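Inputs:
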Amino acid sequence: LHKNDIAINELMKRYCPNSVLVIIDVKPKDLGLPTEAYISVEEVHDDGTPTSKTFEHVTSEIGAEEAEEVGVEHLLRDIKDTTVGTLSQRITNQV
Amino acid sequence: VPGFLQQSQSSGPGQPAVWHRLEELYTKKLWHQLTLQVLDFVQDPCFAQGDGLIKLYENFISEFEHRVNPLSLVEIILHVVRQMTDPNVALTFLEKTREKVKSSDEAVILCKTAIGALKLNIGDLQVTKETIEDVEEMLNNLPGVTSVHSRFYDLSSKYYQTIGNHASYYKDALRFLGCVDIKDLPVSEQQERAFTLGLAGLLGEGVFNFGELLMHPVLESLRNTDRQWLIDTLYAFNSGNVERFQTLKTAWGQQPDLAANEAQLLRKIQLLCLMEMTFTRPANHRQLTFEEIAKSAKITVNEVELLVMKALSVGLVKGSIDEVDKRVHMTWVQPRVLDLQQIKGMKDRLEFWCTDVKSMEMLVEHQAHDILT
Amino acid sequence: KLKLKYYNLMIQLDQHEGSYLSICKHYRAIYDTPCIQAESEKWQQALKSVVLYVILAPFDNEQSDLVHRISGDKKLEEIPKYKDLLKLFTTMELMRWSTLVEDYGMELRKGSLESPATDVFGSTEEGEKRWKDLKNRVVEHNIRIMAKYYTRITMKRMAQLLDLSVDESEAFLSNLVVNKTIFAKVDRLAGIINFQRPKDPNNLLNDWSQKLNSLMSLVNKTTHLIAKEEMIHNLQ
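Outputs:
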């Protein structure tokens, strides 16, 4: 994010009490779970500077409910599932 | 109305020169270059009987012009109040300017700071905390001006002068230390400013060390002008702990206000060394002995209980004390500062973890890479 | 408001013989009558009488938030005896019991309000019962922090720290260990006695789940490290 992304949230704060901006990534490369989440908050500082906004990082997770599971779970058609107990835990030990 | 400003046109030699332009500014009916030129005359030190008379015409301007921000009206009223010498009639007129002016920009923050600046002679303690509490409450939205927060420090510092919870003065002076961007004022004031700041911040009981913010880069140039006994004893409270020569040297340098908090400082450094003794060693090996604490803190074996357990109440360590051999078992630690050449060794402790996991994990799946396919 | 005044009649029954716990919330019920008052001596003596029975009741989880409800009031701190009573409760540590006798021995001469000395020391047998109760409460206050810090201790050092004989240490350790508040280990002949510790599975919960509970912060290290890093880097 460039430093100008703050005022966008400050403009739409009239729409929602707290607007969370989500950085995303169109091309997967690194390092892991894509995108990002930043919430608009005023933390001031321990140095007592005039209040400025440095967006705090919000942890992002990927999930689904029912139909959004149906689409992607059929769309994988790539790697074995899971398989539980053998390759799963050890590849996670690598990654 | 014109003759009212014509009789005040001449304040002395050279004044009517620029005042020939000043009177030509309202003929074109521009009150802004007029605002900057009049405010410059108000900022110009005078008797001053010129601004006291012409403030009614400037009030007449604000009447039909209905616009010009109260900021300039606060800047002129703080110059006039010095010549008025009576804060009461100044409070009636300033609160009149507060109720008679309204704009999208909040005028309550600039008026309450002007009232707080004029409240020093009331003398204090009655309505102070109420309006002082209202300043930063109305400043929370939207603090983009940056100018009034220094005035908030002015009324908050004069609120602290009653003494006044020393521990709070460092937080308020922190607010000032971060409020103003460029100092743009002689260091001869800021050397004693950061001096009594170092006194009230060090003598505070809520802060036992905070050696980190002692190294803050904007105040370190102010400490360079200060004598080095204060900086060295601040390093004693940064690390120390005893270092009995430096904690006495601050008594050589600063006589007053130290006699009351001296024993508090001794307790603060006695609980300060407990984190640094287990932090300095590679350890852990976090179990210490009574001989280590009693020799360092030079206190009797009966008071080391109160010593280490008070640090457990401070929150810097959760450890437990083994009283059979009188040993002290520390747990966790309170991080305070650290240093240069530490980012390097940090890369050594990291890269070793890197090649560890890389090697071993690449050995794990090296065995089972075949069977996968 | 006569029914509220009947509480002052029933406090004689609840405080009379065996219950120091029943006066906890009920002395706060009689405290509501001075709230309507319009009184000075009875109001101020109600503040001290309601703040001085904390030692009477045994230690319990309800006693903590109880004294925390009354703590913070602007009228309460006016008495230096409340400063000492609060000093011993918060942060604990150690204070000489003779100094506690100094502050609690002047309350007979102190006053103004004689009502706390009437409820506590007004009766000879009840006063002595609250003397030994005070002894048991201050030694249990010492045991509470010390037991959590043991590990181990010595018998002779316990005698000089508790300011009482070794047999009195075994007596106070006996009636505290039958209360099963702290499981101790006490052998006087070898001189090595110890309090706590778990006493857990412990091979699974303690060693495993706690160590890798710190590995929660170890795998979250870089997560919040790069966070606060970017925080200080963006604003300046």
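Remarks. The interface with chain B takes residues 91-94, 145-146, 148-154, 157-158, 160-161, 192, 194 of chain C (CB under 8 Å). Strands of chain C lie at 152-154, 184-185, 192-195.
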